[PDB]
Design an enzyme around this catalytic site. Structure first.
Site, PDB file in Angstrom:
ATOM      1  N   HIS A 196       0.870  -1.277  -0.052  1.00 42.32           N
ATOM      2  CA  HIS A 196      -0.209  -0.064   0.146  1.00 42.32           C
ATOM      3  C   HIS A 196       0.838   1.381   0.092  1.00 42.32           C
ATOM      4  CE1 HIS A 196      -0.026  -0.597   4.522  1.00 42.32           C
ATOM      5  NE2 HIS A 196       0.166   0.761   4.261  1.00 42.32           N
ATOM      6  N   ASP A 230       0.096  -7.590   0.549  1.00 37.51           N
ATOM      7  CA  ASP A 230       0.469  -6.192   0.969  1.00 37.51           C
ATOM      8  C   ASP A 230       2.142  -6.339   1.054  1.00 37.51           C
ATOM      9  OD1 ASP A 230      -0.685  -3.626   3.311  1.00 37.51           O
ATOM     10  OD2 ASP A 230       0.444  -3.669   1.466  1.00 37.51           O
ATOM     11  N   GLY A 259       2.044   5.456  10.125  1.00 41.80           N
ATOM     12  CA  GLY A 259       3.706   5.668  10.022  1.00 41.80           C
ATOM     13  C   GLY A 259       4.194   4.370  10.071  1.00 41.80           C
ATOM     14  N   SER A 313       3.388   1.464   8.872  1.00 36.79           N
ATOM     15  CA  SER A 313       3.276   0.623   7.916  1.00 36.79           C
ATOM     16  C   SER A 313       4.655   0.096   7.287  1.00 36.79           C
ATOM     17  CB  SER A 313       2.427   1.416   6.576  1.00 36.79           C
ATOM     18  OG  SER A 313       1.207   1.164   6.715  1.00 36.79           O
ATOM     19  N   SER A 353       1.022  -4.595   7.850  1.00 36.80           N
ATOM     20  CA  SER A 353       0.196  -4.005   6.816  1.00 36.80           C
ATOM     21  C   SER A 353      -1.038  -3.269   7.422  1.00 36.80           C
ATOM     22  CB  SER A 353      -0.624  -5.553   6.421  1.00 36.80           C
ATOM     23  OG  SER A 353      -1.744  -5.054   5.609  1.00 36.80           O
TER      24      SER A 353
END
Ligand SMILES: [Ca+2]
Lengths: 185, 51
Positions: free
Chosen positions: A33, A63, A139, A141, A156
């Protein structure tokens, strides 16, 4: 730079997952993402220190994403902060794990379910996620999930926060390593 | 600035760009939090939660 450090692009700010390679060529893994629609990655909010360019992205469904390093001088440590990473593994329920991210730092927990389906809303659904009771915040991720020296997953998504507790979902790293033909070191 | 996204921001809070454009109202309910992706949206610079 290592697992859990901030990475910036046009898509915003995420965290580096793991430093990986193919022979003598280096890349880093992060969330799909975060790589979706990004081109150049920078190591600083001023966006003056280049890291590399997006080479692959798989989101939704999965992801994961990979960025090819173009900066020859930055240290590319095969660690998560201080923790050295030597190999990758599959999660098991009950596994003690730690996550590192650019918003919250390092937090610990356990794997509570495997193969979770997660609906992020808006037509974005991911499958095969690792479910944990580790907290995370925006942040975080793309940050690494690890167990000792084994690389386990990429952050994810989740609900809750590091002040009250949360649930966090991770993309198994083995699947991205296999998809790109790279390895952790 | 702040680091959030429309999914993870809170119901009751409005998120705006650095130029003052309203981007979205947060979607998370502190009491019944939803699963959201965890990136910082590049467009949100601040928020206001009207009281
Ligand atoms: Ca290493």
């Amino acid at each position: 730079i290592s697992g859990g450090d901030a990475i910036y692009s046009s898509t915003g700010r995420c965290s580096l997952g793991f430093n990986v390679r193919s022979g003598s060529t280096y890349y880093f893994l992060t969330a799909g993402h975060c790589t979706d629609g990004a081109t150049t990655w920078w190591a600083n909010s001023a966006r003056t220190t280049v890291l590399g360019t997006t080479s692959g992205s798989s989101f939704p469904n999965n992801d994961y994403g990979i960025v090819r390093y173009t900066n020859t001088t930055i240290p590319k440590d095969g660690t998560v902060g201080g923790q050295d990473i030597t190999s990758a593994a599959n999660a098991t329920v009950g596994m003690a794990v730690t996550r590192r991210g650019s918003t919250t730092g390092t937090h610990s927990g356990s794997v509570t379910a495997l193969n979770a389906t997660v609906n992020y809303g808006g037509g974005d659904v991911v499958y095969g996620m690792i479910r944990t009771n580790v907290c995370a915040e925006p942040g975080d991720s793309g940050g690494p999930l690890y167990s000792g020296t084994r690389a386990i997953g990429l952050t994810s998504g989740g609900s809750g926060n590091c002040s009250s507790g949360g649930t966090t979902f991770f993309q198994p790293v083995t699947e991205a390593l296999v998809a790109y033909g790279v390895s952790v070191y | 600035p702040i680091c959030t996204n429309c999914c993870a921001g809170y119901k009751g809070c409005n998120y705006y760009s650095a130029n003052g454009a309203f981007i979205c109202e947060g979607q998370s309910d502190p009491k019944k939090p939803k699963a959201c992706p965890l990136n910082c949206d590049p467009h949100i610079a601040y928020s206001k939660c009207p009281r």
